[PDB]
Write a protein that holds these residues in place. Structure first.
Motif, PDB file in Angstrom:
ATOM      1  N   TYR A  38      43.452  41.440  31.496  1.00 53.85           N
ATOM      2  CA  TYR A  38      44.357  41.467  32.676  1.00 53.85           C
ATOM      3  C   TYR A  38      43.544  41.905  33.959  1.00 53.85           C
ATOM      4  CZ  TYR A  38      47.621  41.769  28.641  1.00 53.85           C
ATOM      5  OH  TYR A  38      48.207  41.514  27.428  1.00 53.85           O
ATOM      6  N   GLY A  39      42.246  41.527  34.069  1.00 49.50           N
ATOM      7  CA  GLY A  39      41.431  41.680  35.304  1.00 49.50           C
ATOM      8  C   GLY A  39      41.848  40.755  36.443  1.00 49.50           C
ATOM      9  N   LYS A  40      41.208  40.924  37.600  1.00 53.66           N
ATOM     10  CA  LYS A  40      41.344  39.933  38.709  1.00 53.66           C
ATOM     11  C   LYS A  40      40.147  38.953  38.561  1.00 53.66           C
ATOM     12  CE  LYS A  40      44.591  42.788  40.488  1.00 53.66           C
ATOM     13  NZ  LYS A  40      44.494  43.787  39.405  1.00 53.66           N
ATOM     14  N   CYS A  41      40.485  37.670  38.532  1.00 54.36           N
ATOM     15  CA  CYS A  41      39.517  36.560  38.326  1.00 54.36           C
ATOM     16  C   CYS A  41      39.860  35.356  39.244  1.00 54.36           C
ATOM     17  CB  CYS A  41      39.557  36.131  36.836  1.00 54.36           C
ATOM     18  SG  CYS A  41      41.071  35.361  36.344  1.00 54.36           S
ATOM     19  N   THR A  42      39.086  34.276  39.047  1.00 54.16           N
ATOM     20  CA  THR A  42      39.252  33.007  39.807  1.00 54.16           C
ATOM     21  C   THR A  42      39.039  31.799  38.837  1.00 54.16           C
ATOM     22  OG1 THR A  42      38.159  34.215  41.672  1.00 54.16           O
ATOM     23  CG2 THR A  42      38.382  31.931  42.064  1.00 54.16           C
ATOM     24  N   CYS A  87      41.030  32.563  31.754  1.00 55.62           N
ATOM     25  CA  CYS A  87      41.875  33.034  32.879  1.00 55.62           C
ATOM     26  C   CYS A  87      43.036  32.019  33.098  1.00 55.62           C
ATOM     27  CB  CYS A  87      41.017  33.193  34.163  1.00 55.62           C
ATOM     28  SG  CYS A  87      40.770  34.929  34.433  1.00 55.62           S
ATOM     29  N   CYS A  97      46.343  32.041  36.182  1.00 53.12           N
ATOM     30  CA  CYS A  97      46.612  32.797  37.427  1.00 53.12           C
ATOM     31  C   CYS A  97      47.954  33.608  37.410  1.00 53.12           C
ATOM     32  CB  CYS A  97      46.691  31.839  38.663  1.00 53.12           C
ATOM     33  SG  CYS A  97      45.151  31.384  39.475  1.00 53.12           S
ATOM     34  N   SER A  98      48.011  34.482  38.438  1.00 55.04           N
ATOM     35  CA  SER A  98      49.197  35.261  38.886  1.00 55.04           C
ATOM     36  C   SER A  98      50.488  34.404  39.123  1.00 55.04           C
ATOM     37  CB  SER A  98      48.693  35.959  40.190  1.00 55.04           C
ATOM     38  OG  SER A  98      47.784  37.010  39.884  1.00 55.04           O
ATOM     39  N   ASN A 147      44.813  33.346  43.239  1.00 55.15           N
ATOM     40  CA  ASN A 147      44.404  34.765  42.962  1.00 55.15           C
ATOM     41  C   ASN A 147      44.647  35.035  41.453  1.00 55.15           C
ATOM     42  OD1 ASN A 147      43.659  36.565  45.578  1.00 55.15           O
ATOM     43  ND2 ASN A 147      45.306  35.235  46.253  1.00 55.15           N
ATOM     44  N   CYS A 148      43.801  34.434  40.584  1.00 52.08           N
ATOM     45  CA  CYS A 148      44.086  34.444  39.124  1.00 52.08           C
ATOM     46  C   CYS A 148      43.894  35.848  38.465  1.00 52.08           C
ATOM     47  CB  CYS A 148      43.127  33.484  38.344  1.00 52.08           C
ATOM     48  SG  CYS A 148      43.575  31.748  38.358  1.00 52.08           S
ATOM     49  N   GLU A 149      44.417  35.986  37.221  1.00 56.13           N
ATOM     50  CA  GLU A 149      44.092  37.169  36.360  1.00 56.13           C
ATOM     51  C   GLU A 149      43.497  36.656  35.006  1.00 56.13           C
ATOM     52  OE1 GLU A 149      48.557  38.927  36.509  1.00 56.13           O
ATOM     53  OE2 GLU A 149      47.054  40.672  36.472  1.00 56.13           O
ATOM     54  N   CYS A 150      42.976  37.621  34.228  1.00 57.79           N
ATOM     55  CA  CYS A 150      42.306  37.360  32.920  1.00 57.79           C
ATOM     56  C   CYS A 150      43.376  37.419  31.799  1.00 57.79           C
ATOM     57  CB  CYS A 150      41.136  38.384  32.701  1.00 57.79           C
ATOM     58  SG  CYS A 150      39.629  37.563  33.211  1.00 57.79           S
TER      59      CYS A 150
END
Length: 48
Positions: free
Chosen positions: A9-13, A25, A27-28, A33-36
């Protein structure tokens, strides 16, 4: 060299950094602005 996303649940792309141990990943709530994610069935999966 250290620069990975060590989270499920990190911040990713989509194009940027993915998660560290070959982890996917998705996204949100808005779309950008995606998450893991730990493992996604059909494309993704843990260590890929």
């Amino acid at each position: 060299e250290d620069n990975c996303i060590a989270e499920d649940y990190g911040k990713c792309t989509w194009g940027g950094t993915k998660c560290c141990r070959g982890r996917p990943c998705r996204c949100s709530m808005i779309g950008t602005n995606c998450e893991c994610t730990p493992r996604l069935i059909m494309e993704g999966l843990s260590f890929a």
